[PDB]
Design an enzyme around this catalytic site. Structure first.
Site, PDB file in Angstrom:
ATOM      1  N   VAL A  92      -9.802  44.132  28.594  1.00 61.62           N
ATOM      2  CA  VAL A  92     -10.719  45.282  28.365  1.00 61.62           C
ATOM      3  C   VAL A  92     -12.061  44.498  28.475  1.00 61.62           C
ATOM      4  O   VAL A  92     -12.300  43.427  28.252  1.00 61.62           O
ATOM      5  CB  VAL A  92     -10.624  46.415  27.325  1.00 61.62           C
ATOM      6  N   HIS A 466      -7.483  32.830  16.968  1.00 62.43           N
ATOM      7  CA  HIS A 466      -8.757  32.082  17.393  1.00 62.43           C
ATOM      8  C   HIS A 466      -8.268  30.779  18.100  1.00 62.43           C
ATOM      9  O   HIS A 466      -8.875  29.639  17.999  1.00 62.43           O
ATOM     10  CB  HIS A 466      -9.447  31.395  16.119  1.00 62.43           C
TER      11      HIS A 466
HETATM   12  C1  LIG Z   1      -8.186  39.226  19.692  1.00 61.40           C
HETATM   13  C2  LIG Z   1      -8.754  38.821  18.466  1.00 61.40           C
HETATM   14  C3  LIG Z   1      -9.639  38.241  18.193  1.00 61.40           C
HETATM   15  C4  LIG Z   1     -10.139  37.928  16.871  1.00 61.40           C
HETATM   16  C5  LIG Z   1      -9.903  38.629  15.715  1.00 61.40           C
HETATM   17  C6  LIG Z   1      -8.957  39.415  15.938  1.00 61.40           C
HETATM   18  C7  LIG Z   1      -8.207  39.616  17.233  1.00 61.40           C
HETATM   19  C8  LIG Z   1      -6.916  40.620  17.253  1.00 61.40           C
HETATM   20  N1  LIG Z   1     -10.302  38.348  14.665  1.00 61.40           N
HETATM   21  C9  LIG Z   1     -11.807  37.711  14.602  1.00 61.40           C
HETATM   22  C10 LIG Z   1     -12.980  38.424  14.970  1.00 61.40           C
HETATM   23  O1  LIG Z   1     -13.119  39.772  15.061  1.00 61.40           O
HETATM   24  N2  LIG Z   1     -14.481  37.776  14.932  1.00 61.40           N
HETATM   25  C11 LIG Z   1     -14.380  36.450  15.053  1.00 61.40           C
HETATM   26  O2  LIG Z   1     -15.274  35.596  14.933  1.00 61.40           O
HETATM   27  N3  LIG Z   1     -12.972  35.944  15.463  1.00 61.40           N
HETATM   28  C12 LIG Z   1     -12.186  36.785  15.624  1.00 61.40           C
HETATM   29  N4  LIG Z   1     -11.288  36.991  17.166  1.00 61.40           N
HETATM   30  C13 LIG Z   1     -11.425  35.829  18.017  1.00 61.40           C
HETATM   31  C14 LIG Z   1     -12.633  36.300  18.897  1.00 61.40           C
HETATM   32  O3  LIG Z   1     -12.705  37.716  19.464  1.00 61.40           O
HETATM   33  C15 LIG Z   1     -12.509  35.435  20.169  1.00 61.40           C
HETATM   34  O4  LIG Z   1     -12.531  33.897  19.741  1.00 61.40           O
HETATM   35  C16 LIG Z   1     -13.600  35.468  21.293  1.00 61.40           C
HETATM   36  O5  LIG Z   1     -13.649  36.906  21.624  1.00 61.40           O
HETATM   37  C17 LIG Z   1     -13.089  34.683  22.602  1.00 61.40           C
HETATM   38  O6  LIG Z   1     -13.945  34.937  23.671  1.00 61.40           O
HETATM   39  P1  LIG Z   1     -13.779  34.413  24.986  1.00 61.40           P
HETATM   40  O7  LIG Z   1     -14.892  34.730  25.824  1.00 61.40           O
HETATM   41  O8  LIG Z   1     -13.522  32.934  24.870  1.00 61.40           O
HETATM   42  O9  LIG Z   1     -12.677  35.224  25.701  1.00 61.40           O
HETATM   43  P2  LIG Z   1     -12.281  36.871  25.634  1.00 61.40           P
HETATM   44  O10 LIG Z   1     -10.848  37.162  25.643  1.00 61.40           O
HETATM   45  O11 LIG Z   1     -13.167  37.811  24.718  1.00 61.40           O
HETATM   46  O12 LIG Z   1     -12.759  37.046  27.324  1.00 61.40           O
HETATM   47  C18 LIG Z   1     -11.890  36.886  28.252  1.00 61.40           C
HETATM   48  C19 LIG Z   1     -11.936  38.207  29.054  1.00 61.40           C
HETATM   49  O13 LIG Z   1     -11.292  37.626  30.472  1.00 61.40           O
HETATM   50  C20 LIG Z   1     -10.396  38.753  31.017  1.00 61.40           C
HETATM   51  N5  LIG Z   1      -9.263  37.909  31.948  1.00 61.40           N
HETATM   52  C21 LIG Z   1      -8.599  37.309  31.573  1.00 61.40           C
HETATM   53  N6  LIG Z   1      -7.584  36.793  32.828  1.00 61.40           N
HETATM   54  C22 LIG Z   1      -8.512  37.517  33.624  1.00 61.40           C
HETATM   55  C23 LIG Z   1      -8.085  37.461  35.100  1.00 61.40           C
HETATM   56  N7  LIG Z   1      -7.048  36.725  35.668  1.00 61.40           N
HETATM   57  N8  LIG Z   1      -8.800  37.829  35.938  1.00 61.40           N
HETATM   58  C24 LIG Z   1     -10.006  38.689  35.480  1.00 61.40           C
HETATM   59  N9  LIG Z   1     -10.475  38.699  34.137  1.00 61.40           N
HETATM   60  C25 LIG Z   1      -9.510  38.074  33.279  1.00 61.40           C
HETATM   61  C26 LIG Z   1      -9.817  39.208  29.769  1.00 61.40           C
HETATM   62  O14 LIG Z   1      -9.475  40.686  30.221  1.00 61.40           O
HETATM   63  C27 LIG Z   1     -11.158  39.430  28.713  1.00 61.40           C
HETATM   64  O15 LIG Z   1     -11.830  40.326  28.976  1.00 61.40           O
END
Ligand SMILES: *Cc1cc2c(cc1C)N[C@]1(*)C(=O)NC(=O)N[C@@H]1N2C[C@H](O)[C@H](O)[C@H](O)COP(=O)(O)OP(=O)(O)OC[C@H]1O[C@@H](n2cnc3c(N)ncnc32)[C@H](O)[C@@H]1O
Length: 527
Positions: A92, A466
């Site tokens: 999302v 994490h």
């Molecule tokens: C999921 C989660 C994360 C965390 C917590 C609970 C849960 C259930 N607890 C704590 C939080 O609330 N605060 C905190 O400091 N740490 C926690 N938290 C971890 C962080 O939220 C997490 O480390 C960061 O959000 C990581 O950010 P990053 O930018 O590294 O990755 P994110 O997953 O946010 O963004 C990636 C986006 O990329 C899209 N994606 C993935 N694959 C593709 C492809 N192939 N094409 C196009 N887009 C794609 C994903 O949908 C994500 O939006």
């Protein structure tokens, strides 16, 4: 403009393309767009989060686990861990900043200083990070008595109000156990101390996700293009190995479209999907790519290596009085304490949850309750290292995520976790918690020896969610660091990575704000 049908985008060439609208990606894309002469595309696989209450309303976050908003990555069978554990990852706009508990921390200066000093990441230290934390936030604690704080940034941080009486009593219990109340995010690392968190949440209950904060204000900007519902399948390269863009699909079985970048492509798909996309694009460990029929463009052996996490245990208690029925996010308190002398960072953290967290205990027959609380110890600098690897050459197949929990050779992670369960019990047993702490549901008072607690941890541990470190920055000359200190992918031109993948070493605390900071710094390194 927001494009939600790629078939209507005619001009698919931009100066910059950011892939992944998550914590870091949203920040990078927004900052690059601040120059009206620069055109920026932000590509995200999940939907727009605008007007979506389940995502926007923070106190609903636990409902997103294993929902249609979750990529839902189960882990490989664990040698010394919980094979039933799942790495929830948001699909999302805002990425995991849109599915998380909004716990908001500045990293310890000692962690960031070491990126440069110990891990070869030139230029990455607290001197670079402090002004960026300031820039990204509007902090409730901002003011002349806390001048490090930002008062103007897109990401709103507030203090969780001390409304929960069990929370207040737990802090009183911490004090009795020799753990004082401590303010978070002061610039000074909390080694021994506890409090209600700061959270990145707006006044009205809306999560201050990277999308809410950075993207929603700029969606109509003339030089900014937001593309949602579009999944990257491969990065595209020259000729001369310059990254020229990205192949995407609107649906698993549909036509492949391509976006092109005149300057650079920034990969921000996070610590699981980033190493996967690089490998599918020919950048990764040569033998592994060859195994899956992929042409090796760069033999980059660090890609998908060095996966780090904060593994988590649980201690669950029945509560002797009615627990709160409203919350900011159900996990409102953090406790830090050192298990050894001489530390400048705590080796142990625990969260307090005003719910019974039975995700991994119910399947093993531990008792449930509807009125209880949890203490969740985690290892702040776990020594175990895992991998993310390809399951196949097909982009639609989930990657193989193997954190190798509790496999570190000196048994550090397990040692700290055992200490963590004992410390959780000690705090819960203090006089201030006498009116709260009922029967211990898991592991249960019968579990007392090192061996019994170790067996319990192996069966029932979770994660604080994490995962980091799979495409690390490091010294230009270190072959096992896929990125140089300016986040540039080695062996190719025109491609950077900015997201949790880059961390050479995990940070002590919840990493979300630091990952946003990484995006801010990546924008700066580019501009
Ligand atoms: C999921 C989660 C994360 C965390 C917590 C609970 C849960 C259930 N607890 C704590 C939080 O609330 N605060 C905190 O400091 N740490 C926690 N938290 C971890 C962080 O939220 C997490 O480390 C960061 O959000 C990581 O950010 P990053 O930018 O590294 O990755 P994110 O997953 O946010 O963004 C990636 C986006 O990329 C899209 N994606 C993935 N694959 C593709 C492809 N192939 N094409 C196009 N887009 C794609 C994903 O949908 C994500 O939006």
């Amino acid at each position: 403009m927001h494009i939600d049908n790629i078939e209507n985008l005619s001009d698919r060439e931009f100066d910059y393309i950011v892939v992944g609208g998550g914590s870091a990606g949203a920040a990078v894309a927004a900052r690059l767009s601040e120059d009206p002469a620069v055109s920026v595309a932000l590509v995200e696989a999940g939907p727009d989060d605008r007007g979506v209450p389940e995502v926007l309303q923070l106190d609903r976050w636990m409902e997103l686990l294993e929902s249609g908003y979750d990529w839902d990555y189960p882990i490989e069978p664990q040698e010394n861990g919980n094979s039933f554990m799942r790495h929830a990852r948001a699909k999302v706009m805002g990425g995991c900043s849109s599915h998380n508990s909004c716990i908001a921390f500045w990293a310890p200066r000692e962690d960031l200083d070491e990126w440069e000093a110990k891990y070869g990441a030139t230029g990455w230290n607290a001197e670079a990070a402090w002004p960026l934390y300031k820039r990204l936030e509007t902090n409730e604690d901002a003011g002349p008595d806390a001048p490090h704080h930002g008062d103007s940034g897109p990401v709103h941080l507030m203090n969780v109000p001390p409304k929960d009486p069990t929370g207040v009593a737990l802090l009183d219990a911490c004090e009795q156990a020799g753990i004082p109340r401590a303010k978070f995010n002061t610039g000074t690392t909390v080694v021994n101390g506890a409090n209600f968190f700061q959270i990145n949440r707006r006044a009205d209950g809306t999560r201050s996700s990277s999308s809410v904060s950075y993207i929603h204000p700029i969606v109509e900007q003339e030089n900014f293009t937001l593309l949602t519902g579009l999944r990257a399948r491969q990065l595209v390269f020259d000729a001369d190995r310059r990254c020229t863009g990205v192949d995407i699909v609107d649906s698993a079985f549909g036509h492949t479209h391509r976006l092109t970048a005149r300057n650079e492509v920034v990969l921000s798909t996070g610590a699981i999907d980033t190493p996967k996309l690089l490998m599918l694009s020919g950048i990764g460990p040569a033998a592994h790519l060859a195994e899956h029929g992929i042409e090796v463009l760069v033999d980059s052996p660090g890609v998908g290596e060095h996966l780090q996490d904060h593994p988590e245990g649980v201690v669950q208690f029945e509560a002797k009085q009615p627990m709160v029925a409203e919350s900011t996010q159900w996990w409102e308190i953090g406790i830090f304490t050192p298990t050894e002398d001489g530390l400048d960072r705590p080796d142990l953290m625990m969260h307090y949850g005003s719910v019974p967290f039975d995700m991994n205990t119910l399947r093993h027959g531990y008792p449930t309750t509807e009125n209880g609380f949890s203490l969740t110890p985690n290892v702040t600098h776990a020594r175990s290292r895992g991998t993310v690897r390809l399951r196949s050459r097909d982009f639609r197949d989930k990657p193989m995520v193997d954190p190798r929990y509790f496999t570190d050779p000196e048994g550090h992670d397990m040692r700290v976790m055992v200490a963590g369960i004992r410390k959780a019990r000690e705090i819960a047993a203090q006089p201030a918690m006498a009116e709260w702490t009922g029967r211990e549901l898991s592991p249960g008072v019968e579990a007392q020896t090192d061996e019994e607690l170790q067996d319990y941890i192996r069966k029932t541990h979770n994660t604080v969610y994490h995962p980091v470190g799979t495409v690390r920055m490091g010294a230009v000359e270190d072959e096992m660091s896929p990125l140089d200190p300016e986040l540039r992918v080695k062996g190719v031109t025109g491609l950077r990575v900015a997201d949790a993948s880059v961390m050479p070493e995990h940070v002590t605390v919840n990493p979300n704000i630091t990952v946003m900071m990484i995006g801010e710094r990546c924008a700066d390194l580019i501009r």
